[PDB]
Every structure is written in C-alpha cells, then in structure tokens.
Design a protein around this ligand. Sequence first.
Ligand SMILES: [Mg+2]
Ligand SMILES: [Zn+2]
Ligand SMILES: [Zn+2]
Ligand SMILES: [Zn+2]
Lengths: 182, 91, 43, 109, 86, 58, 527, 86, 98
Amino acid sequence: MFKLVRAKGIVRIPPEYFGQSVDEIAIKILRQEYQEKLIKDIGVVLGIVNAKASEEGFIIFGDGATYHEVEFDMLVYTPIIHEVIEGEVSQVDNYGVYVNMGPVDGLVHISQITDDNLKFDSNRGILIGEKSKKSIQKGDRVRAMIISASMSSGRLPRIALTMKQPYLGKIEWINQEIAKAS
Amino acid sequence: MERDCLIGFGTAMLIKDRLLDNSDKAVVYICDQCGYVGWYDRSKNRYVCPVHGDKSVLHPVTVSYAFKLLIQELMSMVISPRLILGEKVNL
Amino acid sequence: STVTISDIEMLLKDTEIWDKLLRNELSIEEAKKMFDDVARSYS
Amino acid sequence: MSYSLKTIEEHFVPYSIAKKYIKELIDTGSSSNLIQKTFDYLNSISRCDEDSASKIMKELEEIVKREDVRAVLASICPTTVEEVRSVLVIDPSTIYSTEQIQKIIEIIK
Amino acid sequence: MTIDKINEIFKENWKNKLTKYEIARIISARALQLSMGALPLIDTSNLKSDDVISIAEEELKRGVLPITIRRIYPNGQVELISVRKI
Amino acid sequence: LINALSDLRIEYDGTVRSLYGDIVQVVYGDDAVHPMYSAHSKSVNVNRVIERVIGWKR
Amino acid sequence: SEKIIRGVKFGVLSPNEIRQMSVTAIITSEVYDEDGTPIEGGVMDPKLGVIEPGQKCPVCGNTLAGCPGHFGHIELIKPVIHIGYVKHIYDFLRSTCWRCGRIKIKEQDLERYKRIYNAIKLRWPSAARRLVEYIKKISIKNLECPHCGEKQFKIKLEKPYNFNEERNGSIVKLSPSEIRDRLERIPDSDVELLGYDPKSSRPEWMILTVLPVPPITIRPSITIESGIRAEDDLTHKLVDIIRLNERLKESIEAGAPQLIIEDLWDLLQYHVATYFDNEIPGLPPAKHRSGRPLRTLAQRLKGKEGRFRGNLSGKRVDFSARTVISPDPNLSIDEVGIPYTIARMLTVPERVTNINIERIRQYIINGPDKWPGANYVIKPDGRRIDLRYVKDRKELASSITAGYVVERHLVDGDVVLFNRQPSLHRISMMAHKVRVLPGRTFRLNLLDCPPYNADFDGDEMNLHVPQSEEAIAEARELMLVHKNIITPRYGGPIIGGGQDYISGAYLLSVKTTLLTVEEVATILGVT
Amino acid sequence: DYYRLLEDNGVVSPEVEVKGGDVLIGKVSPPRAKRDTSIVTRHGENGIVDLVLITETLEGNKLVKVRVRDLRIPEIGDKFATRHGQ
Amino acid sequence: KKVLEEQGLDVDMRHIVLVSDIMTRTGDIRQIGRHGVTGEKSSVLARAAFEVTVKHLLDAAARGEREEFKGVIENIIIGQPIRLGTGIVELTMKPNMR
Ligand SMILES: [Mg+2]
Ligand SMILES: [Zn+2]
Ligand SMILES: [Zn+2]
Ligand SMILES: [Zn+2]
C-alpha cells in the first residue's frame, strides 16, 4: 500500500553550499541521501516532495558544516500483508508468474493460480489449464493477494502472491464468476 | 605534565591533535545490542558482529587504538566491557 | 533500629521530602511539619 | 552527514492521489527510471481521479474507522457486494451497511 | 542580590562581552569552514596575509559573521549573543 | 593535586562547580578576580589609580 | 552512521558469551609442526587473527589493517578459581547458607533492607555502601540459617586461593566444584542486596569453566635479526594450561588414583591463576628460558611502562623535534629560531583555496630539497604524491585546483609549541612564531628564559607542530607568548630584563650620560 | 644501490664516502633460504672509510673491522670549558 | 600559607582557599590522594589510571559498575573533546547570510 509519512531529522549543509537558500540545499541533500534507499521500519522510499528547514544550524567540533532540523514529507510504499491489489503480468516462466507491483515485481508460483492441474511453458509460452481452459500472457490485468512479505535490502521483490481465494483472478475471470454465482 | 599544561590553557582541539590524530587514531565497529567490536567483511559487503552474525547493525567509532587494545586485554581476563553509543548531533 | 540504619533512613526521608517540595507537590508549611516530625522521631 | 529520521505521521494513500503526488514529484524532481516506471504502472490500473478518490475516502470514515482499508477501497472499486468480504481482512464483522458502501461507489466513480 | 552581589556583578559584566574561549572557538570554526570552500565575507584583495586564520580574524574584528553564541546557565536559563554587527 | 582538582570549572553563574555538578565555591575566590589579572593579589590598587589620574602635579 | 562513546558497562563474562563469541576451540597443544605451518586448533591458529602484511584472514576478508583479532576458548573439565575475584567469592561464601542459598537474615528485616537499598542506591552511593557493609557484617556472624537452623560452619581463606571449612573434623578443604555449586543457589534478589548486579555479574561466573584465548593481534611474534622468532609470554603460558588440560583429562578416563588427580588439579589452577597475574604473593614466579620472570596480563597494565601510563595517559607523537638551545637577542619574544633542516622535514598541511593558490603553486615548484617548498601533494580523492619522484613539478603545479592539500615546509610566521621539561606550570609550553635561520640549534630570546627556567649550559627543548586548522587557531589565540607575560601564580610579570639589560639601563639612564646626534642615531638604529 | 660500495670480497674500500644506511660489510647467514645479515652505517651519520682490517680469531673465523671518520668543525651549539669551572 | 610564605615563595591566597575548600567538602577532612578526594571520583578509568593497579577494574566488573565519561581524563584516554575552555562554548550559524 502506498503511504505518505512526515519526518523530522538533522541535515548537514556542507560549507561549499553556503550563501544560498537553506531549503533548496536541504531538499537536494535529502534527495541525494534518501532516494531509492530502503528503511527498515518505514519501507522503500520513492522520493521527497517538500522539505522545510530552520535557518539556524549548530556547529560541532572537527566539522565546518552546519546541522539543521528539517521537516519533510515522504512517498514511501510498503506492501501490507493481507491486502487485495491489482497488477499486471511482467514475465512468465517455469519459475512462475511475475506480477509487477509498482516499483517492484510480485511473485506467484505455479501451484497457486487455480485449484486444478495446469501446464506451464507450453506452446507460444502460454499457461493452459487442462480442465479450466485458462490462458494468461503479457499485458494482463490480474488482481493479486498478498500472503507474505519481508524486507532486508538483499532483494526487494521477495513478495509471495496468492490466487486460490475465489472472487480473485483476472478481471474477466472474476466477472464471469460473479455472473454465474447468482 | 604536558597534557596538564594543555588542559590548563583550555585547548580541546589542540589536545585532540596532539594525543589522538598524530599517535594512534583508529576506527572500530560496535554492535548496538552488546557493545562488542565487530568487523567489515570486505567481500560480502556486510557488517559482522561476533555474537550477532548479521542480525544487528554496527556503527563506526573513531577511537584511540590503545583503548581498543585495552578493551581486548580486558576481555582476555573474565571482564565484559560493553561500549554504549550515542549521537554526535541531537534534535 | 540501629544508629546507622536510623541515620540512613532519616537521610532518605529528608531526600524524599526535599524532592516532593521541589516539585511543588507540597507547601512550605507541610514540608516544615514533615521535617520536624522526622527530626523528632529519629532523635 | 548525520541524520535521525524520526516519523510523526502515518497517513495512507490510495492509487489515484499517489498518481497525483508522483506526477507532482516527477515534473520538478526529474527522478530516475524507477520513479518514472512506477508512474507508468499507475497510468493504467488507476480508475478514478484525485477528487473521486478523495470523496470516496472521506465519506467512508463513518462506515469504517480504519484508514488503511479506505485506501484500498479507493483504488480497486469492487462495486460488488460479493467481493467486499474478500477485501476485508479484519476479524470483527462489519455492520450490514455494506450495501451503502457500494452505493457511494457509483455516485463518485 | 539574587544569590550575592558579586554574582550579579559577574553576570552583568559578561552580559555583552566575549570570553577568550568564545573568540578562539569562533575563529577556529570560521577558519575550518573557510578552508573547506566557503566564500569570505570581506574583500580579501588587499589583506596582508591570505591564510584562512588571518581572514577569519579580520572577519571577526569587523562584525560580518552570522554566528550566535548560546550560553546555558546552570539553572537552565539561556542567553544568546550575536557577533553579526553586535 | 592534579588528579584531585582536574574537574573544577568556572560557570557563567560565577560559581565553581565540578563536572559532575557538585558546588565547591558559591563565587570563585571572594570577588571572582583572576590572580593573573590581579594587581599583585589586589583586584584594584586605588593608590595606583590616584597616581594615574593626578600624578603629574603631585 | 558515525557515533560516539557515551558510556561503558562492566560485568563478568558469562561462559555462554565466551562460547558464543568464539570462532574455534583450542584442543591441540602443538604450536608448530616440522615444516612450520600452524596447526589448526592450536594457539597460533590463523582463524584468530593476522599479523603478516601479506596474509589475509579467513574469518574476515581483511588484511592486517582491517582485521580485528578473533577470540578462541579453552574448555576446562575441572573448574578453577579466578584469582581476581577471591575477595568477592569469600564474601559470598561467608554470608550465605550452604543449603538454600540465603543471606542468613530474617526475611522480615530483609524485605525492609531491600526496600531501603533500592530507594537510596543512586542518590547516596556512600550510604548504600555503608548499608551493604552493615548487612554483610550482621549476616556473617549468624552461625544458623533462619530458614534452616542447620548450624552453619565458619569458612577461612588461606592465601592465595585456598578455602578451608571448619566442621566437626576441624579440617576439610573445598574444591572449586562445590564452591561453584553453592554459589549457583543464591537468588537474584539476595545478590542485588549484597551490592552486585545479578543480570551482568552472576557470582558463579567467577568460577571458571571456559577460558578465552586472546587474539594473535595482541599476541605478536617479534621478528629478530638473529633468525629465531621469539614468542610473547601469553602463548608460553597458554601452552602450559592446554598441556595440563590434556595431562589431567587422560587420567580421569584411564584410572582414578584420586591423589594424582588432585595433585594435577592444584597445578592447572596454579597455571591459570599465574596466567591471569604474575607476582602473586606467596607464589613462585614463572620463567621460560633464562630464569627471567614472565610478563602476564596484569603486568601489561601496571607500571610506568604499562598500558595505562605508557600508552593511554602519555604517548609518543609525530611532528616533533628536540635540539640544544642557544640565545638570540634579535628575535621577538613571540619568535623561535629553527634550523633549515628541521623546517624542510616537518610540514604543515594546507588545503588549497582560491586565495592562496599561487603561493601554494610556488611551493610546489620548489621540490622537497629547496626551502620554502613542499614534500607531498594530496589529491581531492585522497592519493598522496611524493614530490621527489615527480618527473615534472612545473606541470603538477599548474594542474592543482581548490580542494588539493599540499604538505609544505615551515615558513616564517608559523605557529609551533615550544616546551622545556620538567613541565611544572602551563607556561612551560607556549606558542611561538617560526623564524628559519642558519644553524643547527633552537634559538630563543633572552627575555623568554625565566618562564622556561632555561639556560645556555647545554640545555635542550622540544618542538611540536600542530597539524589541523582548529589546533593552530587555538594555539595562536590562547597560547601565544606575549599574552602570558603575567603569571597566574601571583599578579606579576614572569618576563623581563636580565643581566646586561639591567646594567645597560643603569648606564644609559644615569644623569651624567650625554649623547651626540650620531650616537643617538646609532642607538636608535637597532629599534 | 645499498651494495654499490662493496668490493668483490664483500667489504668496502678505504677513502670512500658513506651515508647513513650504506652497507660496509656484506654477510649472508645459514637458514634458521639464506638470510641477509649485513652491517650498515647508522642512521644520519656520514663519513669516510678510514681503515679496513682482516684477520682471524682463535677458532679460525674471519674477523673484519671497519673504521669510519667524520670531520667536526666548531659551530653554534658546541660546548667549551676552562680549567676554572666556566 | 605560612609554610609557603616562610620560604619566600609568593602564591596567591585564592589557590590555597580553593584547596582548603576541596579537602573539606564532605564535612570531614579528606586527603587529596587515594583514600580521599581522588578515590571518591566517579570514574573507573580515571581511578585505574591514577592508581595503575588493575584491582579497580576487577571490582567494577564484579559489581557491574557503569562509567559515564564526565571527567576530562577519561575523555582524553578514549579520545574525545573535553568540556573545559573552548569545550564549554557552543555555536550556531545562519549560512544564508552572505
Ligand atoms: Mg642548563
Ligand atoms: Zn552484537
Ligand atoms: Zn580477521
Ligand atoms: Zn538455609
């Protein structure tokens, strides 16, 4: 789920950037130091939209730079467990189906698309179900389910997807399911 | 006695320059949970703490090398000196 | 109790009274009364 | 370069106004491809406008008192009563005003 | 007489006066950040010496430095002194 | 002596305190006058001031 | 993120911690085989650390620069007493019951004692110490546990580490196993009331079951030109402990005379106690080859050449010089005369800005052998350049910009610290301005001698060159000579006239002295 | 370049200027490969080779002695005394 | 004062008064050495440096003491700036004012 958090911190203004507006330098330093950088308790950062810094900065021993208190708004995104999110198929192989989830790509394995027997990597690279008559390929719009996810900065797209739950799947699959349910 | 002279004059940065920068300045990595000295692996690009693996975060601290030698010599005896860390700048 | 234990306890009580007075949880008169009570009880 | 990075707010953002914010970020920040790629991901799945997502998210405060579920109801628009329970992952049972939730969907979206 | 008259005289004397430690700290900080690429706030075209410490001394003598000393008294009271044109 | 006295400091109050907060003297010395700035242990030599002012005609 | 040290927490090292931090286990007592490679599992296992410039550590992919030492552990089958904690084990033994492990005080008074101690432990540490001493004094002399009433027996300590009960037989000696088993029974509350931290210093941890093995980084091998490596005494002891550990283990599983077992248990314990500390009172010192007593862990820390007073309170420093001194009446009181040789060896690192670029370029054009010149150039990314190995110094001068660092010679007007020992007051070391002169001596003005108590009978003084901008600024602002004319001991000048000055002043100022225009011009020409 | 002064028998020749670090006698020792155990001029002590002596000890081992001389001219900083304690 | 003065040595009285104050602070007369003012200091490392013995560190480990780096000697030992002289001053700047 996409989030927007507000944060307060200390930003260091190098002496070579003196004589100009503190806000511009502060937002520049924040972008150079927080863009595309994973945070353990907040998630992966997608950028800084606005920042406000105080004009007073304190000086410490051994440094020529000034340190200012800054308040800024972030655009962090973190996929929350047990949430229904739409997505698109990015690549399909014997590994499974890779669904794109914004900056990262989700992962689902062949054992959990439909409660049946299916053959993957068939002719024309299409996953076809023997008793379901289902075809999935590029450009699809799937509505996936989150079951488990963890972040360690070793590999961002380590997200596991789920499709066994009814009322979930392709937009056409769910539409026919609803129509035939009643 | 020269250190006492420098203290009497009130020169903190001169004391630092004489007694740390020009003799045995060093950098060590401390686990934030146990306060023991870790290391940088330089091959897997990760911080490793001896009781801790990669389950904790290590921070670099500039210190006199003789103080680290003293810490290791104290751990040679059955003594557990744990270093407590702090921030240079606070809110 | 023992003289040393009585001294330690009266020091502790004086410390508590001063702490409570300095936090504006007591008035000057109440602090005076408690100080007198402790001094008389531990004399 | 010493930082603290303490957080104060924990607001939630649906897909539609996330498009608004990244657009307000890409135009002046001129970020990398990863930020630009995320915008492409939102160029198709997004179904409503910023005002539509705001209206649906603000009118559901009384029906449900959780901000996280309101941000996913403002991005998917289930518009059916048979799949809302699939979206719900909250143990307490919601009152039988779910039919009102769907009604709010089409008047806005 | 808050505590004693001598203490009041002391605090009144040091109200608008810089101690030698504050002058040394200001000059050292200014020189350190001036050697790191900062732009001098004075002309620096006809000065006798062109090293950073001399320029910092001249910048302190004629108040152009936007630096503020924060004095914290033991009871918690805070006094602010500005060296920018006093 | 150095190890006994090394932690004493002059405060902005005018008080002599230890770095642990203990008060040693309410005001340094008795008049808060540094011996280095003294007129040989005297804060002011009044006879010297008189000589400074009217010494050319005395 | 860069942090700072704001505290140190002390405690006793738990055996679980000793095992957990260890990278290996020392079992073999053989240090080196025929060829010379170190045996895996010995004292010189490469897993412990690297001391060779070209070797790489197995535990961490780091060389001698980036590798901190790693710890091993020696497993002990029979527990031993740590000699540094005997006075604490003795107090734990004398003030606790040996059946239930209690302070031997009625719990009604014990609860209020604990309440008071918890209330006062932080505000009045001395009162807490007195309270703990009182509790120990009244609990030692009980002779019957209130929870048991089992006729507690008094315990006596025989130096160095011999504990002796006094039962009905009047003689029985306690083994470390029973001592540790008794100390395991004490609860955390009773330990806390006695003045010890239970979660960080548990009393039975003072009885050793596992022994840490120091890293080789603190245990280096001295390279002597004689061709034979000399090992430090720590390895020379650790081999003895591991030998006795192997020597005693085989006896347990093969036979049980029970008299040779205790005659080896009293030798391993001696070895461990002497490894921790030599010069134990009432105990023979240990030699290695020539009857010279060994230097052990506690000997590396005490003395005037030990760790503390030799490396922590004071140390040898860089950018310093020492030379005989000679007079110079032509210097200012702020100046010191420096030889050309010393000016060209000691350097000051100056960062290049847009105001000083031409002067630094002229320094670079001159090499390391012409004054004023430079010895090194540091590029902005951080690579040094030896200017004596540069093919063309004129092109390197043209290529420097703001951000470069040039280590240039001393020039006239530089600030240095000038010192004479012993340093009795603070003006025994003052800041001076450099002046480079021909000669091989430190030149000093004659009016500057009283503060240094200096003389020209063959005396020598020290020089120190501050290296950073902040240090130089502090030295120039606070330590300059003329700012310290009046001494802090009393309100009087410590700098003034000497011997020829006084008689010259008398002869000039006497009322019979008459001068002509030429003589006046000659006198005033020196001013 | 530290062995440029040795002759074919491993020892320097008289009337040769030497600097600190120059090798005067070349020597290799049995392993305890062969190790270099040469003797060099001490640090910062120039001079001229004055005498080279080759003989044998009682056992029969070769013994080599080299004398180096340095000229000293009085300069500022040298000590002098009279027969009266001055 | 009498001992110093009868030898012809000039020392200002403020130093002597400060010494007298430091030796009577606790309500009793204490020596400046090990069993007095110096031994009452709340730093383990400073005490172990003045008294080069190691028994102080063993006592601290046994009792689980905590060392907090408030004095000047311990900070010099570990290598951090002291709070005397220029260490009492704290600065603030406005970089924008050019
Ligand atoms: Mg002499
Ligand atoms: Zn750890
Ligand atoms: Zn290693
Ligand atoms: Zn009992």
